[PDB]
Structure formats: structure tokens, C-alpha cells
């Protein structure tokens, strides 16, 4: 008797990172042979970040010849060759000469100005983590760490599942892609679900979708949440909402106000120290998700539960705490 969990949310909300985190905490885990199979993915992510930075820099220079966005002509050439390696079908791991050029691109001031506009780009979140550590990833004896695996970015396009045990209870969690094209595939997974883990990126409120750059990422997340809550298969199904990327949110909400996002235009920032500002904004986002849940659950908590958790999917301590909080909530609530 196996309780089925279903990871849902829009693209890059964090579902696969949570999926790996579950493998790390409740099973083994990785997996040195399978860790090495992530080297090509990590290299691909690096090549893709340089490509998007280099192309975005060139476009930002077209709009503005200040020129805050004009690269050193040397790094303009290096940026072109490195991006053409990524686009090639050949193979080409990142060796020492590659890492030296990538590092040199990443250090150009125009690239860092472009990187400060990552929200206007479609830049993988792991960009700064991997580019800063490009020399380590280029060594011939390099084995990815478990931290590397959690940062590595693979756009999910199939169904994956893993079973795990805690207490005497068996679980099977399913991972599926969240980009628009992959959502046809959700419908047949909707049966026999004991709980939906709905991932929602807190840090996305100043970004537009990869599938449609006219659509705010967070508006899409909230419409998507409402559309899942309104599906008949989930009428009496529990929702655990992971308000993920809390680490990124902490930095962003201090520098980009929430009102940049159309669903947060009524936000009124309080004054105080960094943590009262962070805390107040998070409570405000939580209330908004709560409102969507209440609007769509006539019998509220006697129909289905909806618990909200701020999370950082990369961080095992925060994840271990988050899952223990779930069990602590179930014990106090007398729910089985
Ligand atoms: N800083 C930070 N990065 C995160 C966090 N969660 C996920 N990421 C990073 O964001 C990237 C995208 O996350 P991912 O798990 O692949 O999203 P997804 O929901 O599975 O995306 P898709 O399969 O529907 S396209 C990954 O590279 C991951 O490392 C987080 O909480 N904080
Ligand atoms: Mg995924």
C-alpha cells in the first residue's frame, strides 16, 4: 500500500530539484557513477549560460551604446567561439582552455552588467554558481558533488518516479515537466493522488515565461495553481505548497519591489530591518496563495488541506526541516 505524491508547478519552479532532494534525504542517493553522468549536463548548462549572456549583452548594446554593455573585443570573440561549441552537435567537454575563456568572459564588466539583467534574459539559475566554479568543473578528475547535481538544470520532458520509505510508510513521488507543452501529460497522473506538492517560485515575480515573454512568471504560477485546484480529480486531495527559491527571494525583494508584478500591485512595503521586510513580503504572498485556495475549496479544511511552506530546494537542512514540519503539522492536526 503505497501513497502517491505528485510534483506539480510551472517550469523551473523547482520540482526536479525537490525530486533529487527526496532521493538524497530518504534513500541513497548518489551514486558516483550516476554523479559522473551529470558532467555533460553541467557543461551544457555552462555553455548555455555563456550563450545567453553573450547574445543578451549584444542586444543590450544595440539598445544602449553608453556603452555599459560593450564587451572587450577579446571577450566578444571568446564569447562567440564558446557559444558555437555549445550549439555544435559534436560533444566537446569543458577542458582547461575552455574554462579559462569562460572565466574571462564571466569577468568582463559588460557581461556582469548583462548578468544584472538576468530577469530579462532566460538565464539558468545555476549560472553564477557554475561560472564562478568553472575551473573546478574543468579538471580531468572532476566528479560532480551532490550540490552540483542539485544546481544542474535539465528541462524535464518525461515522467519519472521514485519510491521511498519513512516510518513504516511507503511513498511514490512523481516528477513531471511544468512548461506549457508538458502539461498535457499531467492529466493521466491525476488519479489516486494522496497529496500534490505544488512548487511555486517566490523569486519569479519580475520575470516572464520562457514559453511566452509577454507573460509574467508569477501570474502564470497563480493561474496554474487555480487551474489545478479547480480540477475535479483534486477536489478532496491535499496540497502542500512549496514556495520555493526562498533564498533568491530574500535578496530580490530587498532590491526589486513586489509591485513590479501585476498580482502584487497592491503591496505596501513596511519599514524596518531586512528581516521584517523579508518576513512581511513573504506573509503577503502566502495570504495570496491562501486566498486562491479558499476561493476554490467550498468546505475549506474539511474538504482538503492546503499548507504553505517557504523552501529552498537546493538546501538539505531547509528541506529536511520542511518535511519534518509536514509530519509535525499532521500529528497536531490528527490527520492520517
Ligand atoms: N537558488 C535556488 N535555485 C533553485 C532552487 N530550486 C531550484 N533551483 C534551480 O533552478 C533550476 C530549475 O529547477 P528545476 O528543478 O529543474 O525546475 P522544474 O520545476 O523541474 O522545471 P521543469 O522540469 O518543469 S522545466 C535548477 O537548476 C535548480 O538548481 C532554489 O530553491 N533556490
Ligand atoms: Mg523538472
Residue numbers in the entry: 36 to 371
Quoted passage from the original study:
In all organisms, the core G-protein complex consists of one subunit each of the α, β, and γ proteins and exists in bimodal active versus inactive states. Signaling is initiated when the bound GDP is exchanged for GTP on Gα, which results in conformational changes that dissociate the heterotrimeric complex into Gα·GTP and Gβγ. To avoid response saturation by active Gα proteins, faster deactivation is achieved with the help of GTPase activity accelerating proteins (GAP), such as the regulator of G-protein signaling (RGS), which binds to activated Gα to accelerate GTP-hydrolysis. The two domains of the Gα—the Ras-like domain and the helical domain (HD)—flank the guanine nucleotide binding site.
